[model samples]
Structures are given as C-alpha cells and as structure tokens.
Target: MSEELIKENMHMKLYMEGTVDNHHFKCTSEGEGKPYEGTQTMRIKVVEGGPLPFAFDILATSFSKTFINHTQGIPDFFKQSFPEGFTWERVTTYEDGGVLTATQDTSLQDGCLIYNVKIRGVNFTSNGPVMQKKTLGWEAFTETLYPADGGLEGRNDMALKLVGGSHLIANIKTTYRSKKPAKNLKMPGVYYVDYRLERIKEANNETYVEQHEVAVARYCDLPSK
Candidate 1:
C-alpha cells in the first residue's frame, strides 16, 4: 500500500522472473530432403555498439514492492540476463548424421549484438522447419551486494542459479568487474550489478554448479531524468 507517497510517485522495483521473451534463430542443414552428412553453424558477428544504445521498458508487469534508491525512476536490487546483453557470442551445437561436432570462434566488433547461426548439420530428416529454432531459459536467485554483504536487506545481486543443458557444447562463463561505486544509490558508494553466463544443476542434470555469481551489468536504478 502507499505509505508516505502515492503508488504512482513511489519508484517501483523490478525482478528477473522465471522466463524470457527469447529470440528466434534459424539455420538450414545441407541437402534439402536428401540423405546427406555435413555440419551446422551459428556465428555472432560483432558490430559497433550502434548509435542507438540498447533500450527497454516495462520489464515486469506486476509485483509487490516498497524498495528505494536514488533511482529517481525505476530499478532493481540486482542484475538479470538477456540475449542482446551478450557480446555477440554465437550459440552453435548440432549433429552431423548423428555425429555431433562443433565449430567455435570469436570476432568481436561493435554494433547491435548479432549472432549468426550457420547450422550445417545432419540433413533435414523430418520434413519440418528447415532449421530447428531454439529457446533456452535459466533459473536465478539473489545475493546481497550493497552494505558490503549486509545480508539481503538492501541492494541485491540477481544470481544465475542455473544455466542447464547443451551449454557445455559451447558454454559461457560469467564474472563480475567492479566499476566506481555508484554514488547515486540510497547508500552511495556501494555495488552496482551486472550479468554473465554459467549456472548450477539439479538431480539428473550434472550440468550446473550452484552459484551466486555469473552476472549481468545493469544500473541498480533507472533514470528519472
């Protein structure tokens, strides 16, 4: 409920929920309707950071909150992961005639983060879509960032709890790099969060390592300006 201020005036808080709007990627294998064996490819060719900076709005639809920071507008206690948030890292993994092999490389540039998925894998067996589009999601938790591990009461870190599945076929590892402490937070001179890859696993899925790290870089607060 509205306390000192009305709901519209009070800055709202956001969270990285259980899923994503996922991107659509397509790639065709060699030999259309023919029994052939080859390979599949996916590349994220780099481009300039673009004249238009990455922008987004209305991240969450509804939630409960009374959080604060100098956000002046909207913000979160932690950072979350997104596809475009990557450095154009290609996502490629497929089977060539039942023989799975991979082609990996990196070409960093500056632009709208682009991932070129050139899949040339085992020919199209089922007369379905040319390339099998993929959609991947993950699990997350939170960690206290501000007050220096002051225990999750203030600014928190959105932690990637798990990035399960075919990731090892081309998995990504995440790290945190400290920038000048944000002086605009409720308690200035504290931590600002960011995100990267990697996750933990549950039973039967020995593909994860539980963690509070594996980050993504996003402002703790949104600009009201």
Candidate 2:
C-alpha cells in the first residue's frame, strides 16, 4: 500500500444496534498497530504468533452505557408516549466468562476467523450515532497486532506507526421502532452490524502493516422484559 494509506492502518472500528430494557444502545471499538508484511499468502499463520500477544482497547462500549442510558431514557418516553413509564431500571450486561460459543463462523480478508453469536452479556443496540435518539442495536469490535518482527512492541509502543499484522474489527445490530405507534409498524425484530478496518505504516519504512474490519448480526428470540 502507499505511504499515505499505511498510516490509515493505525486503527480500526466496529458497530452494532438493538434495543433492550425498553431503551436503545450502541457501541464502537478501535486499536493501534505495528509494522509487518500484510496480506501475503505466506504470512497468515506466522502473523498470529507475531512478536506481540494481540493487544486490544475498548474504544466505545455499550456493556455499561446501555444500562446507564436505558435507566434514564425509557421512563421519560413512557410518561409522554403512554401516560405511564415502563419499569426498566438500568441496562445489565450478561456474563460471558471468556467463553464464546460461536453461533456462526466465516473467514476474513487476510485470514482471521469471523465469529458471531448471541452473547450472554451482550445484546443488539440500535445503530445510533452520538447525536441520535434511541435505537435497538448491539455491537462488538477488536484490534490485533501484526509485527514485522512479529514482536509485541510495535502495537504496544505505538510504532514508527507501522510494521505488523495490525488489524481491527467491528459488529452491530438493532431493531426497528417508531416515535409513535402506528398501524402495521415493523416489529423491531431485526438486528445488524457493520465493520471497518484500517492500518498505518512505519515513519521510516522499516516494515508494513495491515488492518482488518468486519460486521455481523443475529435476531433476538424475545424482546427485553
């Protein structure tokens, strides 16, 4: 990739949308990268064992926001929308215990596994931008290190800004609902997510890096009580 584009790999993000506890929620995530040979057929397996143990940061998350915002947003709507407020307190994140039981699996660009499922502590929050109203979408995202030396320093030190398997992932999902109930309105039963990946290069051209992005979604069996 071009020098300008390499800097792009410095970070990556993901999105999701859905409703829970009668309120809407949203999430996003990003990670830094190192330098390395990206997208080469010979590099897939080698990159995973890179110098660094994949490092990640939680950029924006709904695991807590959902509950915090939901507790406040829901009751207000009910008083005005129905002359009565709903009984949703705060959003509660489900527990995963680091156990991810893959419900769906797919392959990503370079060579990463795209895993999807109805996580215990996670649900769809709406696809909401920072300035929008409530929505029902759920999301998750990740960023992993790819090093030229396959060392962890690149992604950890923040690099000449480049040189590794440096990558990113995102996922989002949400349901549909109207400000005011109407005839034949959609059941808000659906969910969806989107992903964006990017990578940056070394300031001195010592190594190359790559970014990966992904989006995924799944429907809910029942609405939040």
Candidate 3:
C-alpha cells in the first residue's frame, strides 16, 4: 500500500478503541436554531523524554444561540417557587457566535485525552443580547473517542466537564461511510463520520431533566510526517 493510503487508514480502527498519533480532525457541531458550530484542528506530538510527552493543541471556532436572563430583582413568587440564591427566571433567546483559538499540553491514556486549553476570542453576543456570551478560559475534560463494535455501534455518552463552566453531559453517535480517495491528495482511503449530540442536564430535584440535540460531522484526514 502507498504511504498516503497507510496514513489515511492510520487510526481508522484504532480510534474506535483508543488514541492515535499525529491525528488531524475537522469537526462541526450544530443544533435546531443553530447549535454550537465549531471546527477543531488537532495533533499529538512527542518530545525526547519530556515530562509532558504528548504536546496537544486544538485550534477552534464556533457559533451558537445565546440565552439572556431578563430577570432582575427577586420577588416573593420567585423566592417561593425557586430554590434559594435563585433570581427571577425569565429569559429571551438571542443569536450569538465567537472564535476560539487556543493551545494546550496533555497526556493520553485508555482512549481518553484531557486538555488544559486556554481560550481567547471575540465575544459577539450583541448589544441587545450577547455574542458567544460566556467565554471559557480553562480546561476541557471531555471524552474523545468512545468504544465501538467494528465501527457499527457509534452511540456513546460524553461527560463534558469544563473547569469554569457547567457540566454538559451529551449522548453522541456517529454513522461512518467510506468514500474514494481524493485525486488532489492522491489518497486511497477516505471516510466520513457524521454524529449527533444530545446534551442532558438534570435539575436539582432530579425529577426533571432538560435535553437538546445537536448535529455534528467529523472528517478524518490523512496524517502527515
């Protein structure tokens, strides 16, 4: 097999079970009114006996909806109906988007990778509402690849724990389909992995839960030397 073909298939199967080296990714996530749309470019590099063996970084950007809480001072009704320390519960939906370009170092194991990513971007919630509202400047403890059955079973849950943000647990599944290699790249194997993520957040009472589904796609790329 050609080097291009080998690189193309580098982690096709290994990814389902665990981590891979020098992997490149192009991913997009969207929702009903416009969920979080972002692209990630990542890779893992190793140094000669460095304390942090793997040097990992992700350059990303995204667009999404902004929830603006219009509630002001607390009232007797709200105080009685809601939990303590909770203010008024009125919000207006608005459009928002932003760019995230950050770098981080990490270590990987058991198909799981953790990133202490630092984010710096332009928030454009808007004067009326907000743009990309809250900006995260911390680590992302999100699951990377989930176990699969010969690439048949792609459904898995991801527990997203951001250092400075709320924990968003999402159920994700990807349907992969093969395609011919590109002529420009002169590669033999290429494929597409389309996925959906449903974010589930449980209420304090545990009796009710809120869920929202988002559509996403990942285009695996040929690794380079």
Q: Highest lDDT: give the candidate number.
A: 3
Candidate 1 stretches greater than 4 Å from native: 1-3, 6-133, 147-164, 168-225
Give per-residue lDDT, candidate 3, residue 143.
19
Candidate 3 lDDT, 1-225, residue by residue in tens: 121111111110001011112222222222222212322222222222212111111121111101111122211111121111111111111123322233222222232222232333343224311121232221222212222322212334333333355543334333221122112122212222233323244333212222332333333446978
Candidate 1 Cα deviation (angstroms), residue 94: 19
Could you tell which candidate, 1 or 2, scores higher by TM-score? 1
lDDT of 2 by residue, 1-225 (tens): 212222223322223233232333332323333212121111011112222111111111211100111121122111122111111111222221111111111112232212121222223233322112221122323222121211111011111111233222232222112233433222222232222222323122212233332322223336788
Which of the numbered candidates is closest to the native, going by highest TM-score?
3
- What are the Cα lDDT values of the candidates? 0.21, 0.22, 0.23
What TM-score goes with each of the models?
0.18, 0.17, 0.23
- Residue 75, model 2, lDDT: 22
When summed lDDT is taken over every stretch of 10 residues in candidate 2, the lowest stretch is 151-160
Cα lDDT tens digits, model 1, 53-133, are 101001100111111221322233221111112111112221221111122211112411122222222332232121221
Better of 2 and 3 by TM-score: 3
Error of 1 at 153 (Å): 15
